A paper describes a structure:
RuBisCO is the most abundant enzyme in nature, catalyzing the fixation of CO2 in photosynthesis. Its common form consists of eight RbcL and eight RbcS subunits, the assembly of which requires a series of chaperones that include RbcX and RuBisCO accumulation factor 1 (Raf1). As the most common form, the form I RuBisCO in plants, eukaryotic algae, and cyanobacteria is a ~530 kDa complex consisting of eight large (RbcL, ~53 kDa) and eight small (RbcS, ~15 kDa) subunits. Given the co-existence of Raf1 and RbcX in most cyanobacteria and plants, the two chaperones might function in concert on RuBisCO assembly.
To understand how these RuBisCO-specific chaperones function during cyanobacterial RbcL8RbcS8 (L8S8) holoenzyme formation, we solved a 3.3-Å cryo-electron microscopy structure of a 32-subunit RbcL8Raf18RbcX16 (L8F8X16) assembly intermediate from Anabaena sp. PCC 7120. In the L8F8X16 structure, eight RbcL subunits form a core of four antiparallel dimers, which resembles the RbcL8 octameric core seen previously in RuBisCO-chaperone intermediary structures. Similar to the L8F8 structure, each Raf1α domain of Raf1 is docked onto the interface cleft between two neighboring RbcL dimers, embracing the C-terminal TIM-barrel domain of an RbcL subunit. However, the Raf1β domain of Raf1, which binds to the equator of RbcL8 in the structure of L8F810, could not be modeled in the final map of L8F8X16 due to the untraceable density. Moreover, similar to the chimeric structure of L8X16 composed of Synechococcus sp. PCC 6301 RbcL and Anabaena sp. CA RbcX13, two RbcX dimers are docked to one RbcL dimer via interacting with the C-terminal peptide of one RbcL subunit and the N-terminal domain of the other subunit. Of note, Raf1α also interacts with one subunit of RbcX dimer (RbcX2) via several hydrogen bonds, including Raf1R140–RbcXK57, Raf1L142–RbcXR102, Raf1P143–RbcXR102 bonds, to further stabilize the complex. In sum, the ternary complex of L8F8X16 has three different interfaces, which possess a buried interface area of ~740, 1000, and 400 Å2 for RbcL–Raf1α, RbcL–RbcX2, and Raf1–RbcX2, respectively. In contrast to L8X16, each RbcX2 moves ~2.6 Å towards the equator of RbcL dimer in L8F8X16, forming an interface area of ~1000 Å2 between RbcL and RbcX2 in L8F8X16, compared to that of ~1400 Å2 in L8X16. Moreover, Raf1α in L8F8X16 moves ~3.0 Å away from the RbcL8 core compared to that in L8F8, resulting in a dramatic decrease of RbcL–Raf1α interface from ~1000 Å2 in L8F8 to ~740 Å2 in L8F8X16. As a consequence, L8F8X16 adopts a rather dynamic structure with a more relaxed RbcL8 core that comprises a 25 Å central pore in diameter, which is ~5 Å larger than those in either L8F8, L8X16 or L8S8 structures.
Residue numbers in the entry:
A (entry chain 4): 2 to 112
B (entry chain N): 122 to 195
C (entry chain F), D (entry chain E): 23 to 64, 80 to 175, 182 to 295, 307 to 329, 341 to 402, 415 to 471
E (entry chain 3): 2 to 102
F (entry chain C): 23 to 64, 80 to 159
């Protein structure tokens, strides 16, 4: 149904919103503590999905920087994620104008 | 016995199926079978029915934080 | 209004129902439940003793109705399913009504005889122990030649499903021989004993008594039919043909939930029926005692009190590559659906030993399928045909 | 896509179905209908030959599917209802699916034997001619004493409905005598012959063979049971107990419409079944030939070709004052549901003569009830109890 | 900054909404048109969620599935993107509590 | 001596017997009752849960023995009267032994059909 979809979408983009969390910390620590950015870049490569369950593995070895990743779920998830409603449907109308043109590109090739 | 360790192995199965530890419990199977015995004892709103699940709830609970969660039922 | 006494504990011996009710606008929650417990039956009256609500859903409430013991006939599922929900689905004061659960007492369960054969009794003539089963659905000679080569890959039985009766191109008698002559040429040549599950459905029952006396004369294995377009009355004349013969066990918003339909069908009979909540009734068909799990649909508590279990059938579709996902969920005691049949037995038998080593078969399931390709060419083809679709968009 | 050939006329002998289909978003109307005619069956294939739409309703279209003649077994309703809609209700590509109609050919109708007794054959032992019938629903002695005084007001029979089987307070044997002893004391004292319709429902059928051999030994009238919680297979062992005895005839968005369920039930058997479209199947149970009325649900055309009719049962509720509204609509050949029973026969018998004078019984119905109060005191009470609710707000 | 990340996310959101289209596309043609069920895996290898690149390859054959892939996305993007503000915030409370304990 | 557990309440569904026992000289009251509950049957064992005495009579004591539900066949009086007192009357360690009572459960009474005719049906 749709509640099967909408609850699946609720965790997918959340894990994407906890990535821009980690990337904001990534550019932040390249300016303040370049040893802490070179070690955060070491752990970042490990191919571990599920951003919510990714920060839990951070508390295992480093219980402190995993709070600053969590910090922006109140702070940067308000300037990125409440702006999604006026910024999905506008792109859908664009895709209604980008791909409808190529029904005409074949038709002109059929012309 | 056979059938009681059947269900203890079931209770540690679902407690380790979870991606998340629930509140007040650790990795020991004494916390596993005392989590189910408390999770299925919240649903009674009666005092002389839940103590069937509290005597067994006070039979397994391993850490002291898992002892306090059983003590809220009383 | 003597049909709603919440000052009352339902006894040890009461019959005890639930209902996920949804009323019309303005209709109170306390008079719709007295509109159920009274119009079911007529000290001889059911009484809605509890009125619990449902959180975060469309205005439902859980009505707990308690009928006495003596109200019903010993050993009947037709009576229980009809004196309870006869004309209670026919009101306009409710938007919907479902029947989520029934507690039978201990005193009323052991009036019934139950399934003839269980988790123990099935292994006598069936030569398979401790590992689940396999079986795939299938003119008249050419139809017999096809089951002649499905069982020769590992299928523990096969299925004459999709409603093959005697048509003018393929009669009923000339289908039984050619899938009896096709068992005698695969029992010895594969080292195991296999059945081919055959329909017994006839217009009359006197003709259905000839489609089941001809099948097993002494000829033939354990051979089944349905419950729909049929009843708990139609399949009582032939489920008690298993009381002589041991021969027919497979049963193939606003409603009645399946766990009510599953209590009705163990107690009627049969050894493996077709179908948290998927885990829910499959801990009713198989267990002895179940404590109250409100987040599983199991709203009551009743021990089954020593009565034969009944296994489950896989109900999702074709599953050739998605084999270790079923082995954990349905466990050991269940049933699942010639190059295309030899890929089925290999992927099943492989996982079961990698469970018993201690390897977590949930978080490792695909690599056990991949290591079984290096000695089986039929699993080399199948894993490429199925779906590796993912998202790494973090 | 060889399952959609609109360049084809369905033959004189084809079996021929309809479907009021509703697909998912973006799903075309021409591939959902090939998703029906192909997954039903498997020159041996059904073909959706027409694709007509529905005006002013949620995106439906009428799919006309034509199965051949030989595909099915002669004389079976279970086969026809199962090889057609087996796994066709189980798609996710459709939002809904209903089965509105079936044309049986002339060649396949007269394989069946049909109802044992008809509009002609019912009047032999039933002593009522040219006027519809009457019958009302009802410890063990005190239960027998109550039907002892319902039939004594004009009720042509009575109903042991609402599921009275043998309970520990009221057994099955001690209910049959006391409503056989209650017929022998109202047959002669009222000048007519009356039955009391009794349930035969048992756990087994061997017990059900004893609840129907005891009833009519030579003891007792024409005595019935249901079709739900039972099948066209369960009620074939006892509808063909009427092939010896003449004794059981009353049958008591996303679905299958009742007119499919009514073709299935005449051809199975029974003499009066319980239930523009209300006029629709009651011109299928009673007529010989019906021409295509698309505004009545009658989407096809098939003559019944000389096979016994079957009457209808009133299905709206209590109707004591609303008597002439039923007499026109169901006509003569139907069946309807001691002071409270003598008001029923008088209001029925009165209207029928005021129809035959030529008085328009539609626009005059209440005044015929009012003139029948001046010789009957039980209709003096009832007309004040029922509803005169109007609006003159012009 | 604070604004371009919201267009950055909206480009990634639109991709995952096209995923739920194709999983709804694939789960329905599995029984209706099984000739059109094992050939949808010719175009969805590695990246499933494309919008027109497969259609440019589907013009030289029958391209009609795309206009259904873009009408599946309508009923979900009009019924999740309005209810989105609580649906993502509610899971934040879970992942606030699980990590604090 | 796992046939005498007085720390146990007999269930709602147990079959439940009594015995007015009289032992030989010196024989204790706690081993004659384990000489009854064990040699009747063979979780499948009866257990004498109570040992109450009898006042002012020749040295009797009331032994309360609790057999499980599943031990017996549904609807049989021959089985119940034989698997309980088969070879328990044949000891020399007792001077006498009587069987004063049996509780059938509610669950086991309604397996039986009973008298065909009653206070009503007669």
């Amino acid at each position: 149904n749709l509640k099967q979809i909408a609850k699946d979408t609720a965790k997918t983009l959340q894990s994407y919103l906890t990535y821009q969390a980690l990337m904001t910390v990534l550019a932040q620590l390249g300016e303040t503590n370049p040893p802490l950015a070179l070690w955060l870049h070491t752990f970042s490569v490990g191919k571990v999905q599920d951003g919510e369950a990714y920060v839990k593995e951070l508390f295992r070895e480093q219980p402190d920087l995993a709070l600053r990743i969590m910090t922006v779920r109140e702070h940067i998830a308000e300037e990125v994620a409440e702006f999604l409603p006026e910024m999905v449907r506008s792109g859908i109308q664009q895709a209604n104008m980008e791909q409808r043109r190529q029904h005409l590109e074949r038709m002109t090739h059929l012309s | 016995d056979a059938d009681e360790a059947r269900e203890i192995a079931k209770a540690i199965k679902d407690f380790s199926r979870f991606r998340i530890l629930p509140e007040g419990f650790s990795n020991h199977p004494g916390d596993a079978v005392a989590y189910q015995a408390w999770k299925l004892a919240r649903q009674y709103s009666d005092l002389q029915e839940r103590s069937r699940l509290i005597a067994r709830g006070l039979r397994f609970a391993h850490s002291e934080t898992a002892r306090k969660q059983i003590e809220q039922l009383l | 209004l003597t049909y709603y006494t919440p000052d009352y504990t339902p006894k040890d011996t009461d019959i005890l129902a639930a209902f996920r009710v949804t009323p019309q606008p303005g209709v109170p929650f306390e008079e719709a439940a007295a509109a159920v417990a009274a119009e079911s039956s007529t000290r001889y009256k059911g009484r809605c003793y509890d009125i619990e609500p449902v959180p975060g859903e469309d205005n439902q409430f859980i009505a707990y109705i308690a009928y006495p013991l003596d109200l019903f006939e010993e050993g009947s599922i037709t009576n229980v399913l009809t004196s309870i929900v006869g004309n209670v689905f026919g009101f306009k004061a409710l938007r919907a009504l479902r029947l989520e659960d029934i507690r039978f007492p201990v005193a009323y369960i052991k009036t019934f005889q139950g399934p003839p054969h269980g988790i123990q009794v099935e292994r006598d003539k069936l030569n398979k122990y401790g590992r689940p089963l396999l079986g795939c659905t299938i003119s008249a000679k050419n139809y017999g030649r096809a089951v002649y080569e499905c069982l020769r890959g590992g299928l523990d039985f096969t299925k004459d499903d999709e409603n093959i009766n005697s048509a003018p191109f393929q009669r009923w008698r000339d289908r039984f021989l050619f899938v009896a002559d096709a068992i005698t040429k695969a029992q010895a040549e594969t080292g195991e004993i296999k059945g081919h599950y055959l329909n017994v459905t006839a217009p009359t029952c006197e003709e259905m008594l000839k489609r089941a006396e001809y099948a097993k004369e002494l000829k033939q294995p354990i051979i089944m039919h349905d419950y729909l377009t049929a009843g708990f009355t139609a399949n009582t004349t032939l489920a008690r043909w298993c009381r002589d013969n041991g021969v027919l066990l497979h049963i193939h918003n606003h409603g009645i939930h399946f766990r009510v339909l599953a209590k009705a069908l163990r107690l009627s009979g049969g050894d493996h029926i077709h179908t948290g909540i998927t885990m829910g009734f499959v801990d009713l068909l198989r267990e002895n005692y179940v404590e109250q799990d409100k987040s599983r649909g199991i709203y009551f508590t009743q021990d089954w009190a020593s009565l034969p279990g009944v296994m489950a059938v896989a109900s999702g579709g074709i599953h050739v590559w998605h084999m270790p996902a079923l082995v954990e969920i349905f466990g050991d005691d269940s049933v699942l659906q010639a190059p295309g049949a030899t890929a089925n037995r290999v992927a099943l038998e492989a996982c079961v030993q990698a469970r018993n080593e201690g390897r977590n078969l949930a978080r490792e399931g695909n690599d056990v399928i991949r290591e079984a390709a290096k000695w089986s060419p039929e699993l080399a083809v199948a894993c490429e045909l199925w779906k590796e679709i993912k998202f790494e968009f973090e």
